[PDB]
């Protein structure tokens, strides 16, 4: 399994950004893939994930309605569309994959991470 | 430390995992492969806030206390930081308590999805056990 992210940057509040996670090898039984976020001084937390059945689950209530996840099979890429960015969204964003575990994703593989700074 | 297939099998054997409660050494080796890739330092944050530690990815929500997981039952009565040692004794002994509950090895998500239903005996093939 390989996960490579791209798309980070520094923007102003209100703007939008789209992160991408190119993945190879995420075809094993009951996989789940998504995004985690780690802001300065805080713990790494789950944001949003999609499972092998196409189900999407949010783990960060503050991003609901602002962040969207989508998967493009033709390009084996997963995206995180981030709208209405706020300074609190500043953090390192990680693409991660794992196994479905009754509504949770037990992560076992991680991308390199990309930085998103909102002023 | 990153262990070798056969090196780990022998180490687990030295601490009574071989056939422990009917679970073959192959199963344990296959579990460690897909759970931590034989890495004793592997740590993975899960979507629910808990973290899985060590070569056997033991959860801080039920088995060990990492001091950062609310409602941690710590059924193995041990700090999660002890599960990262180069010596797999603590991890192996907590695993013994885990497989005794009643879920068998199904408790290990990677094992259930990658090992269960396969020839796990292959994992100990060519080993000087």
Task: Give the sign of the dihedral formed by CA A111, CA B38, CA B114, CA B72.
Answer: negative
Which residue from A minimizes the CA distance to B35?
A108
A vs B: CB pairs below 8 A: 48
The token duo for B67 is 């001091």
Local structure of B65: helix, strand or coil? strand
Contact of A74 with A88, CB cutoff 8 Å: no
Burial of B14 (0-12, 13-18, 19+ CB in 10 A): exposed
CA-to-CA distance for B114 and B122, rounded, in angstroms? 14
Task: Give the sign of the dihedral formed by CA B12, CA B72, CA A96, CA A49.
Answer: positive
Q: Number of folded domains in chain B?
A: 1
Best mutation site among B38, B47, B69 for testing chain A: the one with the most A CBs within 10 Å?
A: B47
Which residue from A minimizes the CA distance to B50?
A106
CA-to-CA distance for B96 and B111, rounded, in angstroms? 15
Q: How far is CA A75 from the centre of its chain?
A: 17
In DSSP notation, chain A reads: -EEEEE--EEE-TT--EEEEEEEESTTSTTEEEEEEEE-TTS--EEEEEEETTS-EEES-GGGTTTEEEEEEGGGTEEEEEE-S--GGG-EEEEEEEEEEETTEEEEEEE---EEEEE-
Breaks in chain B (C to N > 2.5 A) come right after: none
Domain span at residue B20 reads: 1-129
C-alpha dist (Å) from residue A84 to A12, A28, A63, B69: 10, 34, 10, 31
Local structure of B82: helix, strand or coil? helix
Contact of A12 with A6, CB cutoff 8 Å: no
Q: Solved how?
A: X-ray
B87 has binding-site annotation: no
The token duo for A10 is 């520094």
Best mutation site among A29, A52, A99 for testing chain B: the one with the most B CBs within 10 Å?
A: A99
Verify whether the Cβ–Cβ distance B45 to A101 is below 8 Å.
Answer: no
Element holding B97 (H helix, E strand): helix B89-98
Please identify which residue in the block is written with the tokens 């949010």. A58
For domain A1-119, which CATH number applies: 3.40.1130.10, 2.60.40.1250, 2.60.40.10, 2.30.40.10? 2.60.40.10
What residues contact A35, with CB distance under 8 A and at least 6 apart? A19, A21, A46, A47, A48, A49, A69, A80, A93, A94, A95, A96
The token duo for A24 is 């190879």
CA-to-CA distance for A58 and A56, rounded, in angstroms? 7
C-alpha dist (Å) from residue B71 to A49, B66, B87: 24, 11, 28
Q: How big is chain A by its Cα radius of gyration, in Å?
A: 13
CA-to-CA distance for B17 and B25, rounded, in angstroms? 7
Q: Resolution reached, in Å?
A: 2.0
Chain B interface includes A107 (CB < 8 A) = yes
Contact of B32 with B42, CB cutoff 8 Å: no
When CB atoms are compared, the residue of B68, B109, B114 closest to A101 is B109
C-alpha dist (Å) from residue B97 to B74, B77, B100: 11, 11, 5
Domain ranges in chain A are 1-119
């Amino acid at each position: 399994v390989q996960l490579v992210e791209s798309g980070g940057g520094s923007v102003q509040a209100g703007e939008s950004l789209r992160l991408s996670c190119a993945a190879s090898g995420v075809t094993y039984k009951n996989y789940c893939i998504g995004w985690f976020r780690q802001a300065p001084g805080k713990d790494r937390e789950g944001v949003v994930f999609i499972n092998s059945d196409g189900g999407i689950t949010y783990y960060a209530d503050s991003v609901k309605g602002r962040f969207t996840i989508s998967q493009d099979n033709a390009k084996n890429t997963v995206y995180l569309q981030m709208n209405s960015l706020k300074p609190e969204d500043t953090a390192s964003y990680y693409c991660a994959a794992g196994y479905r575990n009754y509504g949770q994703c037990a992560t076992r593989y991680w991308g390199q991470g990309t930085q998103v700074t909102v002023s | 430390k990153v262990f070798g297939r056969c090196e780990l099998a022998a180490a687990m054997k030295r601490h009574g995992l071989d056939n422990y409660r009917g679970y073959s050494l192959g199963n344990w080796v296959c579990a460690a492969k897909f759970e931590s890739n034989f890495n004793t330092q592997a740590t993975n944050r899960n979507t629910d806030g808990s973290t899985d530690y060590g070569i056997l990815q033991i959860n801080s929500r039920w088995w060990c206390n990492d001091g950062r997981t609310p409602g941690s039952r710590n059924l193995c009565n041990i700090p999660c930081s002890a599960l990262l040692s180069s010596d797999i004794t603590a991890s192996v002994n907590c695993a013994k308590k885990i497989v005794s509950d009643g879920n068998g090895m199904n408790a290990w998500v990677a094992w259930r999805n990658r090992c269960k239903g396969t020839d796990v005996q292959a994992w100990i093939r060519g080993c000087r056990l």
